[PDB]
Nucleic acid binder design. Structure first.
Ligand SMILES: Nc1nc2c(ncn2[C@@H]2O[C@H](COP(=O)(O)OP(=O)(O)OP(=O)(O)O)[C@@H](O)[C@H]2O)c(=O)[nH]1
Ligand SMILES: [Mg+2]
Ligand SMILES: [Zn+2]
Ligand SMILES: [Zn+2]
Ligand SMILES: [Zn+2]
Lengths: 196, 43, 168, 559, 159, 141, 85, 133, 65, 263, 114, 49
RNA sequence: AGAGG
DNA sequence: CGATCCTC
């Protein structure tokens, strides 16, 4: 995540070659999408990037402090003094084909954070497994290889679809199921069945 | 850590709301989502 | 004018035009008899209910009242001729296509509408944002809306919040 | 509630979800490890025996393998330990608990499960890496994004249970929603943005690329279309190669605003025999629109054909855009020197309008109309003048944005953002509210201790003149934060509230179903409706169409 | 208020009209006032409509209201869905609530009512009143772990 | 020396605060269009002045660059988020025996800092890295 | 009793999705359990694909008991039911 | 097949309607007192100014998969400078004797008005536009 | 923690450059901008690598164990 | 000589600035890619840690060692250990470096790439010697030790390409530009007022003639003349990066020619 | 954890062969070669060159999914021209061009001083 | 860099979370709603510090 | 109760 | 007397 409420997972890794590149041969470490910008309305993210680019080039810290007189214009002015286009854009080349891109990419440094709750700490799968003592239903939590909850909300979706046998298997074959002996007179689980 | 040591809890006619009076006293941004939103404050 | 009905007739016409490579500068091969009696006959074939009796026959008649209005408004002589410029071969297929699509458009016994309706109102309910007033510009038209109103409605709340008579 | 209605289940999986432009709509990417855990009890028939022995041979750690062999009596041979794990001489009637393989039906879900579309049968495609991969165009019925969302996966254990999924719960079946009688999945994000960019008149493509774009469509006929331009350089328009993705017999007509039949602005839509004749392709065509390409392709060609369509559209548009490129930067929020002077002027006149109304109010002059306080009226006026200001200032900005403006570009495609965003980001943020009214006097007769008593000015009561580009002042900042907080607070309320509404609605209607006499009845067999929805029609099979006998003049009807 | 009313030529026209909006309900008395259209009169209080004009008008008003919330948001839900809900509350003679008060008090099977709210007490009066559950409801089969009379099992298969 | 005073919300009620020592009180009688609009200091009866308006924020928000250029709630989210981030939490991290300890291999000081970060010791003990980032439609992954 | 006669039957001549799905499941189950195939399985080995072929060829020997809310029913063979869908 | 139409036109207007490679051309026949023409042209390939005299031809020859030119001895029905390929999509009769044809050369539109568009311009995927001088 | 061997983005060996960098400031009374350039660090990906680096190891070695 | 043409503008031990005329985009690009990845080099691939009393972790150290550049001059004379007939490694396929450091001094002891020492028999090949460009002759600062602090490890350096791990990269950054005037109109400049005024003019512009205002767009033109700058880490010298880059590409094309023959 | 070995990018597995030549289903005289443990370095290079051949009617490559290091090349030639031949011709041209480049760069390098 | 201000209880580091309350001995007046027979109410939550 | 959407 | 999903 960037310092602007812009959390997101890695979608894929590309090695240096496959990445788009600047004519300097600079390449991204990250590729964030333009679509997560207009709605989120996080302009400081864009300002940060511009500020950081000037900062890296000039070798001077970027003043990102709030109630200041630092203007996008002032920053833009300095970046051009460093011979890059004023608004952070950069002509980029496709790493596959080598061809230029019709778009000039807004590219520069940005402080991104690594957050806890990484894939492998979350990935869980269960076939058969440990059953609870009282309920006789699959246990809870991945640590003890537990069963994921097929709640009532999920039950409803299945009812909607009209998948009666799936819903039956999901509540019997999978999870629970049990064979009880009942009286054809009182109907209670009294029957003291001496099997075999 | 610093953030955790500056936390405020408000138990229980609109406490969740950022009151004018909070200016310079409690942080306007910092607050959890949903659950204790506007009840858990930060100095 | 525009209301949700089964069988998109407009498309069927457009499809027939392309399928039969309709020549707009040629006289068709139908009769006033073909069109007029054709639609009249297609109407009888648009089945929802199937009981041999008068109660169910009226039930059927009622269920298609609106669709038939469309069917007839669209497939009337003048239009079939000067507008659509259809041919007997093309027109007949339209009648079979309408019947087929209509029959496909019908509900299936087993379709769990209870859950469906509930979820169909319930999911859009969750998507409701900043619900206090959005149906206001002045101060006179400031009535309780969104989830708090929907709650009033479902609870059949004896003690409302914005009781309002609108006198014409 | 939690042990009978709902319960923890076997043959289930969960992990973080991720986007995949190379997976089919109806597929789901399943990590090898997850595939290696979940099994399916297959009975040994002569039809399978050769695949089944080889699968028992691969064992529990090589992928297309198995975990258990069940035989006579019902004894489980554990392939991970058994001394005969490499011996096993299969017999018919025996079962082989095999690893979930490519193309198996699975139930894929995102919680909360508010829709029948939050639960969908997917085709397994075993993949490397740890995320559940999914086609971007299935994002919406699930209400998923990839910011860290996790999804659940359930495996059918019976031949009849797999059918239920593949024949009822399948993703292509789900395309046309019964909820709103319109489809529930369309061309979203990059592909939506790119499809607009590709479909412009200006967008022309050449042989080298054209050939790649064509090969990229799997259903490709293998016939190079004749370039719209044969003269110096054979040049294909974007519209052209994209019509390759559209199947034959697809006819679609629109007519936007200006739209003639000679479509001067390249607006509206005309597709004949599945070839785009005119009109730029964007949300209206390719989104989850009622009269959209998707509703048409589903109805005409079929669900499975339409599901394939999403794939082809994506493959082309994606490839094209991957090579074209698209960005968004700070420059895209910057609007003209003269525009800035004009937005400032717009706010300044609103500032005057308010001050004049205030001066008027203070002279005991203004007479409020019947029904409202002399003060109540004052605020409507001010707040109105101030919204007018923001909106007018915003429309000024939008107008100054070029056709090359990446924000304008996304809005135009309908891929992301609205007007308000342009307005707040570049022109002016606007008036902040809490409980309907503008910022209130929390301090005695002032909103902040930086103001004088009894100050009713735009600024004093939460009016943010600055845009996000310009930056907000501390007063603006705090006021915005007050308004912002209300959002987060009610979001918390609304989501908790609506969830309870849903459980009630569901529990109240649960047992209502259409019977074998078209009658909508409950468990007790009581009639709720005599014909479902007063017409005995299924909601998915219904569309808005104009009743031509109702409108126009009597002369116009006569003609 | 603005109104679409047909012109002498036949075409519909935007003929604007004067409409009064009230704070508070006394439907019973306002409709008997001269100079008004008692045909057209309306209240957001569908319960008053129910009492003054009958259950059918109640249903009509109850829908008009439910719809209004859905469209207020900007969203659209097919008529039939809201029509179903509205009809459910309606078919009873009066207005049955979408809470433990309304539908959870109804003649339904004991096991499907204990699935919603007031779980323990619903089953307590089931034993006291000596209730007989039909087991044809969704929830009953869900508890019993049998194939429910839902879509797929709403008919029997034979040779 | 009575150059500064401690004020609570109760006393706050009776005072008049200027936001800037300068901009809020020198003299009165060209401009920078890029700079934000600031209302003319019409009230001139000040009893106090703000040490710095940025001081309205606390620890987590004090980490955000330009929060003043952000939509109100994105500032709220980043606040909760930065507490889910990795880095040197302390120098003695490998002298302590604690459940869960996540430390960034090569943590770097943000190229864009707030003045408040000086006291928050952020550059001394950081939470992220200065990634070279591109806002682009690439493979659509 | 209760049984409605073959003539005088008001239910759809068409097979519901729910009927089709259950029929396909029940047959696919039998195929997968070494029960005989009533059609030429030209190239096919998938129990559902085989049931699908069997349905398309109308050599599925199963009948649907259509219950009505009064308790009465209507029996319809897979051979007789129209398969549009 | 062979030609279906040929005439010399006079450029009225040239409009880059928010386009930077395409232009909408407004033309009139040098012979006919009623014959109109509205057409989209790639003004990057064939730059068109004001009142330029243009020979505009509609043909149907010189379905089958496209083979690159890559043959010197291959001779196409042009000594022309600008050649397009389109589809017929509408045939609006502009009252009495006046008829208009609608051609889309891959989304580059054309509208030709007149009288004698008879046993020559039919609803055809066949449509070749040829411009001269 | 300690001066990364090689720039993440580009690969240019930044490992050897650190002592040299500190000295350049301390002794040669230079500023970061010239100091980075004087070490041949031209691309900004290489620049952030050294400029933004916080050397936690010096504090760490301060602990006796 | 015949096809592709080279013109070296500038050259040093670490960078080569040259123009590549009479070439197609694919070749220029495919050469840039092959330089990044596909060229084999020698890097530390296995670390045995006998002793580590440093503040740094075993694998954090092991990681850096991998990134130390080693003499990859005679790399084609070394086998990939996967093709070697030994049990694990040997001298035909690997180089063994040793590192022993102990903070004897009170003052913080620095552990350099210079401090690594070959123990393998190099059989007279310019291989495995850490690349030292640091003027003080130290190279990479692997680690810092206090006083008690000891570090005892043994590392096997193996042959490999960047396509497996970015440590095997001999190059780093390749500057690459074609048509500095956008005569090709291969890009579309984003602007506020004037594209020419708003975009900085490329250094290669003086190597090409401007478009001349009122000239029609050259539709037929294809890009041929690619302004490049190949930089090296020092494992292999610059001339080799490009020569071996070319050579590898030839080799992989030649395997396809050969694969058609076994078919 | 679920990530496959980096050598899987360039090393052929058991049963895996480099080129897999399949006759195109639709078009006449067209072929589809699956290239194993290769990317855009080879794909774009062969494809670009095949276009320089006048008797090549169609030539296009694709890498169906990034996870896997393989590419598909579809080639169509004129009647009597086998695409396997148009491929080997394209391959040989590439080699020759590269030869000259190596030679020319080497020559240039020997003329420079530093 | 440690700031202190926490407790160490059985090796675990504890933070005493500042608790919000209304100040006592404060006179506040409340307009009571429509059904009650009392128009307004004057309160004081007195205590001994 | 701590956090994740 | 109830108050959205998930795990730890
Ligand atoms: N339908 C739709 N929703 C959007 C659009 N843009 C943003 N949103 C929504 O705006 C909200 C804010 O984005 P997020 O910060 O990711 O919301 P979140 O992931 O649920 O995290 P929380 O803020 O804790 O709720 C989410 O509900 C998004 O789905 C849009 O263009 N269309
Ligand atoms: Mg999310
Ligand atoms: Zn008994
Ligand atoms: Zn670098
Ligand atoms: Zn060896």
């Amino acid at each position: 995540a960037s310092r602007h409420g812009q959390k997101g997972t890695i979608g894929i890794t590309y090695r240096r070659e496959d990445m788009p590149f600047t004519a300097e041969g600079i390449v991204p470490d990250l590729i964030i999408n333009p679509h997560a910008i207009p709605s989120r309305m996080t302009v400081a993210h864009l300002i940060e990037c511009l500020l950081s680019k000037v900062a890296a080039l000039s070798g001077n810290e970027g003043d990102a402090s709030p109630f200041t007189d630092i203007t996008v214009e002032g920053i833009s002015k300095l970046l051009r003094e460093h011979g890059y286009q004023s608004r952070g854009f950069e002509v980029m080349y496709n790493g596959h084909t080598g061809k230029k891109l019709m778009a000039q990419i807004f590219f520069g440094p940005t402080y991104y954070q690594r957050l806890r709750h990484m894939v492998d700490d979350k990935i869980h799968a269960r076939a058969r497994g440990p059953m609870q003592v009282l309920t006789r239903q699959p246990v809870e939590g991945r640590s003890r290889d537990g069963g994921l909850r097929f709640g009532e909300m999920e039950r409803d979706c299945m009812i909607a679809h009209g998948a009666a046998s799936f819903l039956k298997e999901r509540l019997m074959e999978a999870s629970d199921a049990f064979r009880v002996h009942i009286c054809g007179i009182c109907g209670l689980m009294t029957v003291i069945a001496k099997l075999n | 850590t610093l953030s955790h040591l500056r936390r405020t809890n408000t138990p229980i006619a609109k406490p969740r709301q950022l009151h004018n009076t909070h200016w310079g006293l409690v942080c306007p941004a910092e607050t959890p989502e949903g659950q204790a939103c506007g009840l858990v404050k930060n100095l | 004018a525009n209301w949700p009905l089964p069988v998109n007739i407009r498309r069927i016409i457009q499809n027939a035009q392309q399928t039969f490579h309709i020549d707009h500068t040629k006289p068709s091969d139908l009769t006033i008899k073909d069109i007029v009696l054709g639609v009249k006959d297609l109407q009888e074939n648009l089945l929802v209910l199937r009981g041999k009796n008068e109660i169910i026959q009226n039930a059927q008649r009622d269920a298609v009242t609106l669709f038939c209005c469309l069917l007839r408004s669209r497939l009337a002589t003048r239009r079939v001729l000067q507008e659509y410029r259809l041919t007997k071969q093309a027109f007949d297929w339209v009648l079979s296509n309408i019947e087929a699509q209509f029959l496909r458009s019908v509900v299936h016994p087993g379709e769990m509408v209870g859950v469906l309706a509930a979820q169909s109102i319930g999911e859009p309910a969750t998507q409701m944002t900043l619900n206090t007033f959005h149906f206001a510009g002045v101060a006179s038209k400031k009535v309780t809306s969104g989830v708090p109103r929907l709650k009033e409605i479902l609870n059949v709340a004896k003690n409302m919040k914005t009781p309002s008579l609108t006198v014409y | 509630r939690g042990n009978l209605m709902g319960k923890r289940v076997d043959f289930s999986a969960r992990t973080v979800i991720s986007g995949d432009p190379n997976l089919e709509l109806d597929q789901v990417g399943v990590p090898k490890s997850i595939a290696k855990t979940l099994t399916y009890p297959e009975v040994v028939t002569p039809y399978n025996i050769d695949r089944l022995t080889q699968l028992v041979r691969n064992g529990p750690n090589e992928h297309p393998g198995a975990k258990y062999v069940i035989r006579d009596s019902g004894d489980r041979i554990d392939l991970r330990y058994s001394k005969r794990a490499g011996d096993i001489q299969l017999q018919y009637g025996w079962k082989v608990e095999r690893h979930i393989m490519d193309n198996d039906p699975v139930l894929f879900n995102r919680q909360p499960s508010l829709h029948k579309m939050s639960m969908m049968a997917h085709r397994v495609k075993v993949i490397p890496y740890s995320t559940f991969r999914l086609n971007l165009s299935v994002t919406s019925p699930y209400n998923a994004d990839f910011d860290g969302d996790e999804m659940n996966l359930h495996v059918p254990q019976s031949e009849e249970t797999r059918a239920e999924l593949s024949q009822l719960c399948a993703v292509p079946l789900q395309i046309v929603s019964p909820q709103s009688n319109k489809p529930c999945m369309g061309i979203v994000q990059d592909t939506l943005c790119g499809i607009r960019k590709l479909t412009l008149r200006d967008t022309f493509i050449e042989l080298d690329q054209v050939l790649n774009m064509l090969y990229w469509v799997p259903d490709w006929d293998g016939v190079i279309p004749t370039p719209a331009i044969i003269k110096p350089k054979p040049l294909w328009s974007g519209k052209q190669i994209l019509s390759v993705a559209i199947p034959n017999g697809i006819h679609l007509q629109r007519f936007d605003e200006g739209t003639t039949l000679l479509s001067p602005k390249d607006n509206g839509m005309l597709i004949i025999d599945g070839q785009i004749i005119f009109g730029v392709v964007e949300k209206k065509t390719v989104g989850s629109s009622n009269g959209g390409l998707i509703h048409v392709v589903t109805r005409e060609k079929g669900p499975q054909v339409c599901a394939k369509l999403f794939g082809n559209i994506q493959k082309v548009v994606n490839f094209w855009l991957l090579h074209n490129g698209f960005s968004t930067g700070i420059g895209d929020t910057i609007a003209d020197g003269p525009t800035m002077r004009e937005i400032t002027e717009t706010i300044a006149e609103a500032k005057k309008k308010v001050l004049d109304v205030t001066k008027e109010a203070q002279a005991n002059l203004l007479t409020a109309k019947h029904g409202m306080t002399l003060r109540e009226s004052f605020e409507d006026n001010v707040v109105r003048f101030l919204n007018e200001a923001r909106d007018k200032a915003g429309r000024l900005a939008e107008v100054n944005l070029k056709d090359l403006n990446n924000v304008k570009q996304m809005v135009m495609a309908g891929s992301k953002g609205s007007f308000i965003n342009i307005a707040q980001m570049s022109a002016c943020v606007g008036q902040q509210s809490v409980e309907g009214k503008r910022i209130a006097f929390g301090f005695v007769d002032r909103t902040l201790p930086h103001f004088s008593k009894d100050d009713y000015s735009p600024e004093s009561k939460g009016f943010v003149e600055n845009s996000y580009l310009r930056g907000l002042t501390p007063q603006e900042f705090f006021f915005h934060a007050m308004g912002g907080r209300e959002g987060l607070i009610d979001t918390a309320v609304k989501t908790a509230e609506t969830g309870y509404i849903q459980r009630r609605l569901v529990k109240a209607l649960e047992d209502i179903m259409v019977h074998y006499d078209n009658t909508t009845r409950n468990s007790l067999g009581n009639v709720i409706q005599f014909i479902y929805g007063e017409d005995g029609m299924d909601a998915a099979h219904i569309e808005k169409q104009s009743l031509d006998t109702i409108g126009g003049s009597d002369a116009a009807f006569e003609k | 208020y603005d109104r679409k009313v047909p012109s002498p030529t036949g075409e519909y026209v935007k003929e604007p009209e004067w409409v009064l909006e009230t704070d508070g309900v006394n439907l019973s008395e306002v409709m008997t006032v001269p100079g008004i259209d008692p045909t057209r009169i309306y209240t957001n209080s569908f319960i008053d409509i129910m009492e003054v004009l009958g259950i059918e008008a109640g249903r009509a008003a109850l829908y008009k209201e439910v719809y209004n919330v859905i469209a207020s948001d900007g969203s659209y839900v097919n008529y039939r869905h809201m029509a179903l809900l509205v009809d459910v509350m309606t078919t009873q003679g009066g207005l049955t609530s979408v809470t433990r008060h309304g539908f959870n008090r109804s003649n339904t099977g004991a096991l499907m009512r204990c699935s919603f709210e007031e779980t323990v007490e619903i089953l307590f009066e089931a034993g006291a009143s000596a209730e007989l559950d039909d087991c044809r409801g969704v929830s009953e089969n869900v508890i019993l772990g049998q194939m429910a009379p839902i879509g797929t099992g709403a008919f029997d298969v034979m040779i | 020396e009575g150059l500064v005073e401690y004020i609570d919300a109760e006393e706050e009620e009776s005072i008049l605060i200027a936001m800037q020592p300068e901009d809020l009180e020198p003299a009165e009688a060209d401009v920078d269009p890029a700079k934000r609009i600031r209302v003319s200091h019409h009230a001139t009866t000040f009893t106090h002045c703000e040490i710095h308006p940025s001081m309205i924020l606390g620890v987590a928000a004090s980490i955000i660059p330009f929060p003043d250029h952000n939509q109100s709630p994105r500032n709220t989210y980043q606040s909760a988020m930065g507490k889910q981030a990795m880095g040197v939490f302390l120098t003695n991290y490998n002298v302590r025996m604690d459940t869960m300890a996540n430390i960034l291999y090569y943590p770097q000081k943000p190229l864009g800092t707030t003045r408040a970060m000086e006291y928050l010791k952020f550059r001394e003990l950081p939470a992220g890295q200065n990634a070279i980032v591109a806002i682009a439609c690439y493979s659509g992954y | 009793e209760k049984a409605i006669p073959k003539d005088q039957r008001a239910t759809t001549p068409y097979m519901t999705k729910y009927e089709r799905a259950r029929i396909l499941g029940t047959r696919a189950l039998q195929i997968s359990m070494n029960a005989p195939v009533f059609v030429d399985l030209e190239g096919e080995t998938d129990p559902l694909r085989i049931a699908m072929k069997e349905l398309a060829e109308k050599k599925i020997p199963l009948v649907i008991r259509r219950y009505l809310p009064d308790g009465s029913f209507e029996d319809w063979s897979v051979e007789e039911l129209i398969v549009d869908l | 097949s062979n030609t279906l139409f040929d005439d010399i036109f006079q450029v009225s207007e040239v409009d880059p309607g928010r386009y930077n490679k395409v232009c909408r051309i407004e033309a009139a026949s040098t012979t006919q007192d009623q014959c109109k023409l509205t057409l989209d042209i790639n003004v990057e390939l064939f730059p068109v100014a004001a009142q330029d005299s243009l020979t505009v031809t509609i043909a149907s020859s010189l379905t089958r998969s496209w083979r690159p030119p890559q043959a010197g001895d291959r001779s196409l029905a042009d000594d022309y400078d600008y050649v397009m390929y389109g589809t017929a999509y509408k045939f609006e009769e502009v009252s009495k004797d006046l008829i208009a044809v609608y051609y889309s050369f891959g989304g580059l539109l054309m509208r030709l008005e007149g009288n004698y568009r008879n046993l020559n311009n039919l609803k055809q995927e066949n449509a070749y536009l040829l411009i001269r001088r | 923690m300690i001066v990364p061997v090689r720039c993440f983005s580009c690969g240019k060996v930044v490992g050897d450059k650190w002592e040299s960098y500190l000295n350049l400031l301390q002794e040669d009374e230079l500023d970061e901008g010239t100091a980075l350039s004087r070490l041949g660090l031209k691309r900004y990906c290489c620049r952030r690598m050294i400029l933004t680096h916080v050397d936690l190891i010096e504090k760490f070695l301060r602990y006796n164990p | 000589e015949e096809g592709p043409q080279v013109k070296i503008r500038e050259a040093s031990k670490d960078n080569v600035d040259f123009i590549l005329s009479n070439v197609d985009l694919a070749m220029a690009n495919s050469l840039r890619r092959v330089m990044i990845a596909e060229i084999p080099t020698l890097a530390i691939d296995s670390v045995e840690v006998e002793t580590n009393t440093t503040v740094l972790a075993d694998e954090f150290i092991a990681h850096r060692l991998g990134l130390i550049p080693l003499q990859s001059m005679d790399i084609e004379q070394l086998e990939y250990s996967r093709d070697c007939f030994c049990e694990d490694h040997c001298d035909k396929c690997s180089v063994v470096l040793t590192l022993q450091a102990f903070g004897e001094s009170e003052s913080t002891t620095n552990v350099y790439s210079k401090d690594l020492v070959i123990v393998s028999n190099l059989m007279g090949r310019n291989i495995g010697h850490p690349i030292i460009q640091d003027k003080e002759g130290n190279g990479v600062l692997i680690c810092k030790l206090r006083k008690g602090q000891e570090l005892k490890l043994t590392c096997v350096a193996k042959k490999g390409i960047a396509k497996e791990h970015a440590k095997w990269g001999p190059a780093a950054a390749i500057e690459f530009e074609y048509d500095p005037w956008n005569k090709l109109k291969h890009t579309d400049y984003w602007y506020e007022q004037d594209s020419a005024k708003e975009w900085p003019q490329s250094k290669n512009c003086e190597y090409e003639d401007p478009p001349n205002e009122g000239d029609p767009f050259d539709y037929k033109a294809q890009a041929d003349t690619f302004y490049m700058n190949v930089e090296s880490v020092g494992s292999i010298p610059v001339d080799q990066v490009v020569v071996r880059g070319i050579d590898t590409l030839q080799k992989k094309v030649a395997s396809i020619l050969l694969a058609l023959t076994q078919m | 954890m679920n990530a496959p070995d980096r050598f899987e990018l360039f090393l052929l597995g058991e049963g895996e062969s480099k080129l897999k030549i399949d006759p195109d289903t639709k078009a006449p005289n067209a072929v589809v070669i699956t290239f194993e443990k290769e990317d855009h370095t080879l794909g774009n290079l062969i494809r670009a060159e095949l276009l320089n051949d006048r008797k090549v009617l169609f030539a296009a490559y694709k890498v169906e999914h990034p996870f896997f290091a393989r590419f598909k090349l579809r080639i169509q030639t004129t009647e009597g021209y086998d695409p396997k031949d148009a491929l080997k011709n394209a391959c040989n041209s590439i080699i020759n061009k590269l030869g000259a480049l190596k030679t020319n760069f080497e020559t240039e390098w020997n003329l420079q001083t530093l | 860099f440690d700031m202190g201000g926490y407790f160490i209880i059985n090796g675990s580091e504890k933070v005493l979370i500042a608790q919000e309350r209304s100040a006592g001995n404060i006179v506040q007046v409340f307009k009571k709603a429509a059904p009650s027979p009392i128009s307004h109410v004057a309160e004081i939550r007195s205590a001994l510090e």
